[PDB]
Amino acid sequence: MREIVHIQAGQCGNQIGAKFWEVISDEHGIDPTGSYHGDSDLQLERINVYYNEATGNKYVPRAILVDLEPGTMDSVRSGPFGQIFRPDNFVFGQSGAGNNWAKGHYTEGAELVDSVLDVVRKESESCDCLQGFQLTHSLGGGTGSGMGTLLISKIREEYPDRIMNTFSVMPSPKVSDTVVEPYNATLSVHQLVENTDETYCIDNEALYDICFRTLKLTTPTYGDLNHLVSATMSGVTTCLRFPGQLNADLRKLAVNMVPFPRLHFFMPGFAPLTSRGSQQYRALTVPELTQQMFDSKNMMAACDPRHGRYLTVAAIFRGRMSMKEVDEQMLNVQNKNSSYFVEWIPNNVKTAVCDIPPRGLKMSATFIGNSTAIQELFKRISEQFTAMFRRKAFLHWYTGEGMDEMEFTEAESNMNDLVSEYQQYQDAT
Amino acid sequence: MRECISIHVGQAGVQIGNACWELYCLEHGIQPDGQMPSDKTIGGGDDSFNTFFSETGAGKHVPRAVFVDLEPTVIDEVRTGTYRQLFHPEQLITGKEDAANNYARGHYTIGKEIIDLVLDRIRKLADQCTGLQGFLVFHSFGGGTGSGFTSLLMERLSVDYGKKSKLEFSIYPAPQVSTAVVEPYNSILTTHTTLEHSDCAFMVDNEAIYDICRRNLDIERPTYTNLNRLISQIVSSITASLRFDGALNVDLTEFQTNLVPYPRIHFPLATYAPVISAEKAYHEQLSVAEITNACFEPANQMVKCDPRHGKYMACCLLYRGDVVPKDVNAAIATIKTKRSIQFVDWCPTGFKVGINYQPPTVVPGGDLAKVQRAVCMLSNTTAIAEAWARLDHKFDLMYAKRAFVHWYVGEGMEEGEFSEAREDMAALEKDYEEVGVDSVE
Amino acid sequence: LGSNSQVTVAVRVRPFSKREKTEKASQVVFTNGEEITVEHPDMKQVYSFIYDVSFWSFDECHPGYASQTTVYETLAAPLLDRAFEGYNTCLFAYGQTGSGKSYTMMGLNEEPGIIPRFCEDLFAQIAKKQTSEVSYHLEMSFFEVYNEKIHDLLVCKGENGQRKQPLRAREHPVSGPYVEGLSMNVVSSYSDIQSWLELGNKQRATAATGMNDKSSRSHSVFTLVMTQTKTEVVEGEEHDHRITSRINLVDLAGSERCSTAHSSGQRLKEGVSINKSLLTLGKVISALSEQANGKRVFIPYRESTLTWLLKESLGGNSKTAMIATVSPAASNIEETLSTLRYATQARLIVNIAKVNEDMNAKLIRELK
Ligand SMILES: CC(=O)O[C@H]1C(=O)[C@@]2(C)[C@H]([C@H](OC(=O)c3ccccc3)[C@]3(O)C[C@H](OC(=O)[C@H](O)[C@@H](NC(=O)c4ccccc4)c4ccccc4)C(C)=C1C3(C)C)[C@]1(OC(C)=O)CO[C@@H]1C[C@@H]2O
Ligand SMILES: Nc1nc2c(ncn2[C@@H]2O[C@H](COP(=O)(O)OP(=O)(O)OP(=O)(O)O)[C@@H](O)[C@H]2O)c(=O)[nH]1
Ligand SMILES: Nc1nc2c(ncn2[C@@H]2O[C@H](COP(=O)(O)OP(=O)(O)O)[C@@H](O)[C@H]2O)c(=O)[nH]1
Ligand SMILES: Nc1ncnc2c1ncn2[C@@H]1O[C@H](COP(=O)(O)OP(=O)(O)O)[C@@H](O)[C@H]1O
Ligand SMILES: [Mg+2]
């Protein structure tokens, strides 16, 4: 049995994870009490992946909840699926980080992380075989960027042979939501790059465009954006829970997707997304999904993959399909658009197919891609970063908590080198 | 849980405080007698939010506030008004003499004999908390109390409590309108002292609001019972994320980080866009864009300082009510597209956003209308250096002849303290200039 | 930076082992003096390689026998000359398991390696040039890499079930990478050097395996810092011009297949880590050899602590020498070929060495 630990840090991770447990609870037929009210039996064979069992045929999710303010947590408890979480796994404090990475990593979060790890060490030992960890957080704030990367270093040292799969919201290019995004993200990227195996880069600006152009939602709230991310989180681990023709897992996706140990930042996606009124006008076929998967405008990364080259991509399908229709179509993409694919990887596409689709769709698809267009995200932050650091714009709130100017230069060099390591593979000579 | 102490000093503080707790009681369902009949009708809930109101077992809800004047008149309105049964009777009216609009009186002579009580009741209030987030000092430049007593107090709290946010909400002196001859001195004196202890001082001038109420609310002859209701709303938006639910919550240490680049330029402004009458509540949509653009209008600032003569460093936008995030992102981009709004080269992000789901409430008898969404802006601009210069020139004109000085020496001040405080404001005038110089290589 | 110092490569053929005598192994590596020929035992295909220097310790009485002191006086002594000139210097070993890298560098008590001769010759040269004009200051450190963690060899541990306190690496903008917290000890004489070396080698991790009963299961870096403080003809302060030099002498671990040296657990774990580090080093060498041919190439320094801390030696600013160590047994012909290929690929590396005057951007800059 393969099992996963979920960790929800901050206001962005918890508001996502709550929908993740609101989505997963639907595929497995669990109601908000923790009781099973399903129809099929495949909903129970591998329930041990995300959930643990209880006395009266009740199922408690193996989730961990972390923040530095109680507001995020009381929303979960006072909500649709609040009761299922183990109340001893709501870990929190007071006096939030203040969008200061220094406060989440060194000063305040350090006084709370020991309680967090004890909950981790309990859940992990209750598992038969641990596969990996699942973190949902945000870059741009203090808690998710500081308290998250603090846990990552600790879990990695304790569990170095397991996968650390990290879902992360990156800062947008046009409009910020904090002033100190580039300081906090650069310091977080310095830690993720060294202490993860696969991290999925999500951007809120792209999710607005997806809701705008495809779903035709002109008043999209955060409950809808997270309703997109939660899908991708489900598609990745589908083949650990349901049966299929050609199986896959987190370690198999990593091996194919990650050629070098540092280039593990991905641009996710999900199909088939459509308007509620334009669903009875398209045929749901595998080639309809591939056209939607490799579309520049269905990526949640806010980077144009047509400004680079795909190093290796993946495609996790779900439903009754024909493997000729799947492999023939992934081939047509590589041969047609040969310039957006690396020359020294003859087949840049891994595949996976599951026989159990989502609750109300004949079939679904999930897309994971590693491209050199992520260059634009780390390059953009560095220009913001150095312009602020060249004059020490907001630095005196970070040094005041026990940081030096040296630690900023390290995060800049490592980020800038990664920018070149991706750019080393954009030229064809 | 999250708990803040509101302090109001002097007359400009109290008459604002009376408007605030008028509002805090309505949003939470509290009557003036401290009771909450809804909770016994409900059987649950913490709507008696322990940020601003402590609760006893008898059902009475007691506010976390201390305010003091050094004259007994204005508090005595409260000890005999409609809110007497709400407050703790420990309100400081040890004000047998006033500060006579003298710093030297609120900092020394009658600056003491009253402070040991003030620190004790605060320490009692803090000992009732499961965690503090900071202070909220409401005062006014120009007086002796709001200038002197505010400084002595801010000094002591920086020793006993230390690293706790201290947010000031002060009445900045206006360029033309003024109710005193010796305002320039008192402002430069406490500004010198409060600079090294405060973290973010939110400025407001009474001259801008007179025009806001004129043009927007269509009040042709307002008084301080109107100016102080708007100021009550600016504070509610700042402190809303500690009481009610929301999507993007904002704690008090987040203003300290995003709006204060360097430790000496922590003088931001404020405003409130959808300030409209009941009649003009019709005829308008009041979307996120129309409200957000108004906050950048130079005519709707609550401080008389044209931002077009300077550059923006940081801006925190706090939304309330039925607001969707995409509407904010689309709007903030529209502002960065407009060329009359120049940001410093070293701050390409510039904007912070905060969103809440509890709309504003309407104080009955008021001039503001009921709306579904409301916005509060907080900005740090280089234009305010012009206002510091006006005060320094007024200072120099009437200090070159040593006018009104013998009233300050008569209380214990030295002739040299004026210089020591004029030099620190001449260094501040440069730091605002050094920041605004675009970089080169 | 008006120079181009080519990395100087050497090769050393070790003699047959106990294991390689118990198994009746043949001889497949030969020399004709300066070249090195290798033959597959199948009589199918022959390869030849050429290096700047080549040593032959296969048999004591053969012609061309390059003993321990001859290897020293051929490779390490010029590095001491450049260290006295004012350059940073590096000497690093390479080879498969049991090739004899620890022997060639440190050696045994009755056969001192390169380090106990380098430091001794250094102190001796100082004793003849410690005149009134110039003084000398010497610091030493000796650190270890084990499972990608950094350890200090020149401290006396506490007593616990865990007494390997790990340090961390950092990147100074000007000086490059370094180790935070490393005990740098001021030295006075060769006897103190020897005491510290004894302590370090007793602290270094070792284990019995199927190819080395005393195996070198951790990378080891020996750093000397030499500062020559000289005096100009001055009307004022004497002793006013200093030159610094760092000497890095590096003994790395060998590849080691898991099936030949069959052992499970911690041995397997540290072998895996060793293998990873060696892979990254190979990538670095190949990338630098491709830089030498005019292509735009990215050097993966950051993928391992070893290359990260040796960033300034494999390239950068120092005069570098490599010592490949090989075995003549036919059973290890593939690993010998891989080592020799990486070694001859390393000859194409070019580093920009400069003198560390500590006077540029001060006065000698605009003087010249
Ligand atoms: C049956 C029904 O109501 O009709 C569809 C529907 O109208 C459409 C528009 C749905 C609907 O999509 C949305 O409304 C939506 C809005 C914001 C963000 C994301 C989705 C639907 O919600 C999506 C939903 O699909 C699912 O329920 C999947 O199980 C989904 N889980 C949930 O939606 C869910 C259910 C209960 C509680 C919380 C979430 C899922 C996706 C991936 C992996 C596992 C599960 C379905 C069939 C529909 C609705 C409900 C309208 C589509 O959604 C998906 C998953 O692609 C859009 O295209 C599909 C299918 C339909 O076209
Ligand atoms: N906005 C507002 N400002 C006020 C109010 N009352 C007084 N002020 C301002 O206070 C300034 C003068 O300082 P005071 O507040 O009177 O000084 P003080 O704190 O009372 O100290 P004393 O004069 O010694 O009693 C004037 O410029 C007024 O604009 C008020 O009710 N609302
Ligand atoms: N997708 C999504 N992102 C969010 C949500 N709430 C906050 N964020 C992002 O999270 C960041 C805020 O940082 P946060 O962790 O809340 O700061 P903190 O509360 O001090 O730890 C912003 O950059 C937002 O873009 C949400 O509901 N959905
Ligand atoms: N030239 C040589 N003369 C004598 N013995 C040698 C020679 N080269 C290697 N050896 C033997 O090889 C063995 C292993 O050498 P060592 O340097 O420990 O290998 P490793 O590379 O594993 O550290 C030593 O016991 C040593 O006796
Ligand atoms: Mg008064």
mmCIF file of N, CA and C in Angstrom, chain A residues 11 15 69-71 74 94-100 103 174-182 205 208 212 217-222 384 387-388 390-397 400-401, chain B residues 1-2 130 132-133 163 199 246-249 251 253-254 256-263 314 324-326 329 332-333 336 345-353 434-435 437 439 441:
data_model
loop_
_atom_site.group_PDB
_atom_site.id
_atom_site.type_symbol
_atom_site.label_atom_id
_atom_site.label_comp_id
_atom_site.label_asym_id
_atom_site.label_seq_id
_atom_site.Cartn_x
_atom_site.Cartn_y
_atom_site.Cartn_z
ATOM 1 N N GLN A 11 -2.664 30.578 4.078
ATOM 2 C CA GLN A 11 -4.000 30.913 3.611
ATOM 3 C C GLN A 11 -4.282 30.372 2.220
ATOM 4 N N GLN A 15 -6.917 26.813 1.803
ATOM 5 C CA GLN A 15 -8.099 27.065 0.992
ATOM 6 C C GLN A 15 -8.119 26.175 -0.243
ATOM 7 N N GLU A 69 -1.895 31.852 12.028
ATOM 8 C CA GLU A 69 -3.088 32.585 12.418
ATOM 9 C C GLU A 69 -4.243 31.597 12.506
ATOM 10 N N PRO A 70 -5.164 31.768 13.461
ATOM 11 C CA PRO A 70 -6.265 30.802 13.579
ATOM 12 C C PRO A 70 -7.396 31.026 12.594
ATOM 13 N N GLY A 71 -7.402 32.142 11.866
ATOM 14 C CA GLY A 71 -8.512 32.422 10.969
ATOM 15 C C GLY A 71 -8.645 31.393 9.870
ATOM 16 N N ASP A 74 -10.162 28.067 11.514
ATOM 17 C CA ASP A 74 -11.561 28.101 11.924
ATOM 18 C C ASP A 74 -12.491 28.060 10.720
ATOM 19 N N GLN A 94 -0.219 32.333 16.826
ATOM 20 C CA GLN A 94 -0.740 33.679 16.662
ATOM 21 C C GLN A 94 0.354 34.564 16.089
ATOM 22 N N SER A 95 -0.012 35.805 15.770
ATOM 23 C CA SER A 95 0.962 36.796 15.330
ATOM 24 C C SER A 95 1.679 36.339 14.069
ATOM 25 N N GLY A 96 0.943 36.265 12.963
ATOM 26 C CA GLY A 96 1.455 35.725 11.722
ATOM 27 C C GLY A 96 2.751 36.361 11.261
ATOM 28 N N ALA A 97 3.321 35.755 10.218
ATOM 29 C CA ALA A 97 4.684 36.075 9.818
ATOM 30 C C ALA A 97 4.807 37.489 9.277
ATOM 31 N N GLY A 98 3.702 38.098 8.870
ATOM 32 C CA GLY A 98 3.771 39.447 8.358
ATOM 33 C C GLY A 98 4.380 39.544 6.985
ATOM 34 N N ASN A 99 4.219 38.509 6.167
ATOM 35 C CA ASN A 99 4.819 38.452 4.839
ATOM 36 C C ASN A 99 6.328 38.663 4.908
ATOM 37 N N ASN A 100 6.937 38.125 5.960
ATOM 38 C CA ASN A 100 8.378 38.166 6.177
ATOM 39 C C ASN A 100 8.888 36.732 6.241
ATOM 40 N N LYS A 103 10.544 35.611 9.449
ATOM 41 C CA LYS A 103 9.746 35.291 10.623
ATOM 42 C C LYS A 103 9.211 33.869 10.555
ATOM 43 N N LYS A 174 2.216 40.680 -13.703
ATOM 44 C CA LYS A 174 1.610 41.988 -13.896
ATOM 45 C C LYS A 174 1.273 42.684 -12.589
ATOM 46 N N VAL A 175 0.448 42.059 -11.757
ATOM 47 C CA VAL A 175 -0.032 42.642 -10.512
ATOM 48 C C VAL A 175 0.443 41.773 -9.361
ATOM 49 N N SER A 176 1.095 42.398 -8.391
ATOM 50 C CA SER A 176 1.503 41.717 -7.181
ATOM 51 C C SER A 176 0.354 41.654 -6.183
ATOM 52 N N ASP A 177 0.561 40.857 -5.139
ATOM 53 C CA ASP A 177 -0.312 40.819 -3.972
ATOM 54 C C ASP A 177 0.426 41.075 -2.672
ATOM 55 N N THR A 178 1.754 41.106 -2.716
ATOM 56 C CA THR A 178 2.587 41.659 -1.668
ATOM 57 C C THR A 178 3.714 42.438 -2.333
ATOM 58 N N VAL A 179 4.349 43.330 -1.569
ATOM 59 C CA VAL A 179 5.434 44.133 -2.125
ATOM 60 C C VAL A 179 6.734 43.347 -2.143
ATOM 61 N N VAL A 180 6.913 42.443 -1.186
ATOM 62 C CA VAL A 180 8.172 41.742 -0.998
ATOM 63 C C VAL A 180 8.138 40.335 -1.598
ATOM 64 N N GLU A 181 7.324 40.116 -2.631
ATOM 65 C CA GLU A 181 7.336 38.848 -3.362
ATOM 66 C C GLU A 181 8.721 38.401 -3.810
ATOM 67 N N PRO A 182 9.535 39.221 -4.481
ATOM 68 C CA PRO A 182 10.804 38.702 -5.005
ATOM 69 C C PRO A 182 11.804 38.330 -3.934
ATOM 70 N N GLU A 205 -2.529 34.362 -12.221
ATOM 71 C CA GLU A 205 -2.902 35.121 -13.409
ATOM 72 C C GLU A 205 -3.371 34.196 -14.523
ATOM 73 N N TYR A 208 -6.881 32.830 -13.963
ATOM 74 C CA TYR A 208 -7.899 33.797 -14.348
ATOM 75 C C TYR A 208 -8.179 33.723 -15.841
ATOM 76 N N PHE A 212 -11.506 32.683 -17.916
ATOM 77 C CA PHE A 212 -12.049 33.739 -18.762
ATOM 78 C C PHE A 212 -12.286 33.247 -20.184
ATOM 79 N N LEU A 217 -16.070 32.331 -17.278
ATOM 80 C CA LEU A 217 -16.451 32.764 -15.912
ATOM 81 C C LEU A 217 -15.879 34.172 -15.740
ATOM 82 N N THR A 218 -16.719 35.192 -15.672
ATOM 83 C CA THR A 218 -16.246 36.566 -15.552
ATOM 84 C C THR A 218 -16.303 37.077 -14.117
ATOM 85 N N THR A 219 -16.839 36.287 -13.186
ATOM 86 C CA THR A 219 -16.710 36.540 -11.750
ATOM 87 C C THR A 219 -16.138 35.297 -11.079
ATOM 88 N N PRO A 220 -14.874 34.970 -11.346
ATOM 89 C CA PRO A 220 -14.275 33.799 -10.708
ATOM 90 C C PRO A 220 -13.678 34.131 -9.354
ATOM 91 N N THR A 221 -14.064 33.346 -8.359
ATOM 92 C CA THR A 221 -13.577 33.486 -6.995
ATOM 93 C C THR A 221 -12.490 32.448 -6.733
ATOM 94 N N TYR A 222 -11.822 32.595 -5.588
ATOM 95 C CA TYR A 222 -10.736 31.689 -5.240
ATOM 96 C C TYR A 222 -11.223 30.261 -5.047
ATOM 97 N N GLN A 384 13.424 42.160 -10.392
ATOM 98 C CA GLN A 384 12.785 42.781 -9.238
ATOM 99 C C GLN A 384 13.699 42.737 -8.025
ATOM 100 N N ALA A 387 17.019 45.058 -8.089
ATOM 101 C CA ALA A 387 16.660 46.471 -8.056
ATOM 102 C C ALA A 387 16.294 46.912 -6.648
ATOM 103 N N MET A 388 15.687 46.017 -5.873
ATOM 104 C CA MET A 388 15.350 46.314 -4.489
ATOM 105 C C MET A 388 16.555 46.113 -3.581
ATOM 106 N N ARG A 390 19.760 46.229 -4.517
ATOM 107 C CA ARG A 390 20.812 47.184 -4.839
ATOM 108 C C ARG A 390 20.711 48.446 -4.002
ATOM 109 N N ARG A 391 19.526 48.743 -3.467
ATOM 110 C CA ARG A 391 19.298 49.898 -2.610
ATOM 111 C C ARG A 391 18.719 49.506 -1.255
ATOM 112 N N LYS A 392 18.567 48.209 -0.994
ATOM 113 C CA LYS A 392 18.147 47.719 0.316
ATOM 114 C C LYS A 392 16.768 48.256 0.674
ATOM 115 N N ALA A 393 15.803 47.984 -0.204
ATOM 116 C CA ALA A 393 14.506 48.635 -0.118
ATOM 117 C C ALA A 393 13.756 48.249 1.144
ATOM 118 N N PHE A 394 13.617 46.946 1.398
ATOM 119 C CA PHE A 394 12.839 46.445 2.526
ATOM 120 C C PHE A 394 13.649 45.453 3.347
ATOM 121 N N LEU A 395 14.970 45.595 3.350
ATOM 122 C CA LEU A 395 15.834 44.565 3.901
ATOM 123 C C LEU A 395 15.879 44.612 5.418
ATOM 124 N N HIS A 396 15.646 45.782 6.009
ATOM 125 C CA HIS A 396 15.867 45.944 7.437
ATOM 126 C C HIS A 396 14.832 45.214 8.283
ATOM 127 N N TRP A 397 13.786 44.655 7.670
ATOM 128 C CA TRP A 397 12.858 43.807 8.405
ATOM 129 C C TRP A 397 13.289 42.350 8.401
ATOM 130 N N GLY A 400 16.623 42.204 10.826
ATOM 131 C CA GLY A 400 16.216 42.351 12.210
ATOM 132 C C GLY A 400 15.812 41.059 12.889
ATOM 133 N N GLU A 401 15.620 39.983 12.129
ATOM 134 C CA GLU A 401 15.199 38.697 12.662
ATOM 135 C C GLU A 401 16.314 37.662 12.665
ATOM 136 N N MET B 1 -5.449 33.954 20.645
ATOM 137 C CA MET B 1 -6.241 34.799 19.708
ATOM 138 C C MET B 1 -5.633 36.187 19.557
ATOM 139 N N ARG B 2 -6.233 36.988 18.685
ATOM 140 C CA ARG B 2 -5.683 38.267 18.268
ATOM 141 C C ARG B 2 -6.348 39.379 19.058
ATOM 142 N N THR B 130 -4.319 36.559 25.348
ATOM 143 C CA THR B 130 -3.597 35.374 24.914
ATOM 144 C C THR B 130 -2.675 35.671 23.741
ATOM 145 N N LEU B 132 -0.835 39.618 21.924
ATOM 146 C CA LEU B 132 -1.052 40.938 21.354
ATOM 147 C C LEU B 132 -0.473 41.018 19.954
ATOM 148 N N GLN B 133 -1.031 41.923 19.158
ATOM 149 C CA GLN B 133 -0.570 42.193 17.809
ATOM 150 C C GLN B 133 -0.043 43.608 17.646
ATOM 151 N N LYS B 163 9.268 44.903 20.777
ATOM 152 C CA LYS B 163 8.895 44.536 19.419
ATOM 153 C C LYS B 163 7.410 44.218 19.329
ATOM 154 N N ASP B 199 6.280 52.642 14.162
ATOM 155 C CA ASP B 199 6.482 51.747 13.032
ATOM 156 C C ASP B 199 5.727 52.187 11.790
ATOM 157 N N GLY B 246 -12.366 36.192 5.662
ATOM 158 C CA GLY B 246 -11.914 36.814 4.436
ATOM 159 C C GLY B 246 -11.107 35.850 3.602
ATOM 160 N N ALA B 247 -10.783 36.302 2.391
ATOM 161 C CA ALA B 247 -10.002 35.485 1.472
ATOM 162 C C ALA B 247 -8.515 35.749 1.644
ATOM 163 N N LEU B 248 -8.114 37.008 1.515
ATOM 164 C CA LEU B 248 -6.738 37.448 1.711
ATOM 165 C C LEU B 248 -6.714 38.283 2.981
ATOM 166 N N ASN B 249 -6.399 37.640 4.096
ATOM 167 C CA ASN B 249 -6.369 38.327 5.370
ATOM 168 C C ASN B 249 -5.046 39.057 5.539
ATOM 169 N N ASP B 251 -2.669 40.863 8.536
ATOM 170 C CA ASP B 251 -2.358 41.114 9.930
ATOM 171 C C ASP B 251 -1.697 42.484 10.067
ATOM 172 N N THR B 253 1.275 43.303 11.295
ATOM 173 C CA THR B 253 2.682 43.331 10.933
ATOM 174 C C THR B 253 2.905 43.302 9.429
ATOM 175 N N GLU B 254 1.834 43.302 8.631
ATOM 176 C CA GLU B 254 1.968 43.312 7.182
ATOM 177 C C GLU B 254 1.997 44.728 6.628
ATOM 178 N N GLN B 256 3.502 47.051 8.358
ATOM 179 C CA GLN B 256 4.835 47.445 8.791
ATOM 180 C C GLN B 256 5.895 47.013 7.784
ATOM 181 N N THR B 257 5.636 45.935 7.046
ATOM 182 C CA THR B 257 6.620 45.377 6.130
ATOM 183 C C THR B 257 6.532 45.941 4.723
ATOM 184 N N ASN B 258 5.328 46.128 4.194
ATOM 185 C CA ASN B 258 5.160 46.494 2.795
ATOM 186 C C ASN B 258 5.196 47.993 2.558
ATOM 187 N N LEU B 259 4.808 48.789 3.548
ATOM 188 C CA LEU B 259 4.666 50.227 3.395
ATOM 189 C C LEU B 259 5.810 51.014 4.015
ATOM 190 N N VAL B 260 6.761 50.345 4.659
ATOM 191 C CA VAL B 260 7.865 51.006 5.346
ATOM 192 C C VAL B 260 9.182 50.475 4.793
ATOM 193 N N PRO B 261 9.682 51.010 3.677
ATOM 194 C CA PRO B 261 10.946 50.516 3.124
ATOM 195 C C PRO B 261 12.129 50.742 4.044
ATOM 196 N N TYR B 262 12.343 51.997 4.413
ATOM 197 C CA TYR B 262 13.396 52.413 5.310
ATOM 198 C C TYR B 262 12.793 52.875 6.631
ATOM 199 N N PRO B 263 13.541 52.790 7.732
ATOM 200 C CA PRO B 263 12.911 52.948 9.050
ATOM 201 C C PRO B 263 12.442 54.354 9.366
ATOM 202 N N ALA B 314 4.837 52.376 -2.097
ATOM 203 C CA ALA B 314 4.080 51.198 -1.718
ATOM 204 C C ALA B 314 2.646 51.615 -1.462
ATOM 205 N N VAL B 324 -14.545 40.355 -5.791
ATOM 206 C CA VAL B 324 -13.954 39.180 -6.420
ATOM 207 C C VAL B 324 -12.510 39.528 -6.773
ATOM 208 N N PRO B 325 -11.543 38.625 -6.570
ATOM 209 C CA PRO B 325 -10.135 39.011 -6.772
ATOM 210 C C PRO B 325 -9.776 39.461 -8.178
ATOM 211 N N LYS B 326 -10.331 38.823 -9.209
ATOM 212 C CA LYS B 326 -9.996 39.197 -10.579
ATOM 213 C C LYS B 326 -10.308 40.662 -10.846
ATOM 214 N N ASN B 329 -7.270 42.566 -9.677
ATOM 215 C CA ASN B 329 -6.103 42.414 -10.538
ATOM 216 C C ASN B 329 -6.266 43.209 -11.824
ATOM 217 N N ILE B 332 -5.807 47.017 -10.675
ATOM 218 C CA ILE B 332 -4.448 47.417 -10.329
ATOM 219 C C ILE B 332 -3.590 47.541 -11.583
ATOM 220 N N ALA B 333 -3.887 46.747 -12.610
ATOM 221 C CA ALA B 333 -3.165 46.873 -13.868
ATOM 222 C C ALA B 333 -3.526 48.168 -14.577
ATOM 223 N N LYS B 336 -1.340 50.912 -13.153
ATOM 224 C CA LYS B 336 0.052 50.885 -13.586
ATOM 225 C C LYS B 336 0.190 51.259 -15.055
ATOM 226 N N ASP B 345 11.713 53.217 -9.243
ATOM 227 C CA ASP B 345 12.318 52.138 -10.006
ATOM 228 C C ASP B 345 12.650 50.933 -9.140
ATOM 229 N N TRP B 346 12.912 51.136 -7.851
ATOM 230 C CA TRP B 346 13.280 50.038 -6.966
ATOM 231 C C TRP B 346 12.086 49.318 -6.354
ATOM 232 N N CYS B 347 10.865 49.581 -6.812
ATOM 233 C CA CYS B 347 9.670 48.887 -6.333
ATOM 234 C C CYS B 347 8.776 48.617 -7.533
ATOM 235 N N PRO B 348 9.072 47.570 -8.310
ATOM 236 C CA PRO B 348 8.223 47.253 -9.464
ATOM 237 C C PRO B 348 6.925 46.569 -9.096
ATOM 238 N N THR B 349 6.833 45.979 -7.909
ATOM 239 C CA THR B 349 5.596 45.359 -7.463
ATOM 240 C C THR B 349 4.634 46.429 -6.976
ATOM 241 N N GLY B 350 5.007 47.122 -5.915
ATOM 242 C CA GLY B 350 4.258 48.288 -5.468
ATOM 243 C C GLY B 350 3.006 48.044 -4.672
ATOM 244 N N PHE B 351 2.162 47.127 -5.125
ATOM 245 C CA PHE B 351 0.815 46.987 -4.603
ATOM 246 C C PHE B 351 0.697 45.801 -3.663
ATOM 247 N N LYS B 352 -0.061 46.000 -2.591
ATOM 248 C CA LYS B 352 -0.563 44.922 -1.752
ATOM 249 C C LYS B 352 -2.082 44.945 -1.811
ATOM 250 N N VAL B 353 -2.696 43.784 -1.608
ATOM 251 C CA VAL B 353 -4.138 43.612 -1.706
ATOM 252 C C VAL B 353 -4.616 42.835 -0.492
ATOM 253 N N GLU B 434 16.665 61.338 -1.459
ATOM 254 C CA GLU B 434 17.576 60.276 -1.869
ATOM 255 C C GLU B 434 16.812 59.070 -2.392
ATOM 256 N N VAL B 435 15.656 58.787 -1.797
ATOM 257 C CA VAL B 435 14.850 57.647 -2.213
ATOM 258 C C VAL B 435 14.280 57.875 -3.604
ATOM 259 N N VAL B 437 15.452 59.468 -6.128
ATOM 260 C CA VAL B 437 16.414 59.580 -7.214
ATOM 261 C C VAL B 437 16.541 58.216 -7.870
ATOM 262 N N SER B 439 17.932 55.143 -9.994
ATOM 263 C CA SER B 439 19.285 54.630 -9.896
ATOM 264 C C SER B 439 20.001 54.728 -11.238
ATOM 265 N N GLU B 441 24.096 53.456 -13.247
ATOM 266 C CA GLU B 441 25.261 52.584 -13.186
ATOM 267 C C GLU B 441 26.259 52.936 -14.286
#
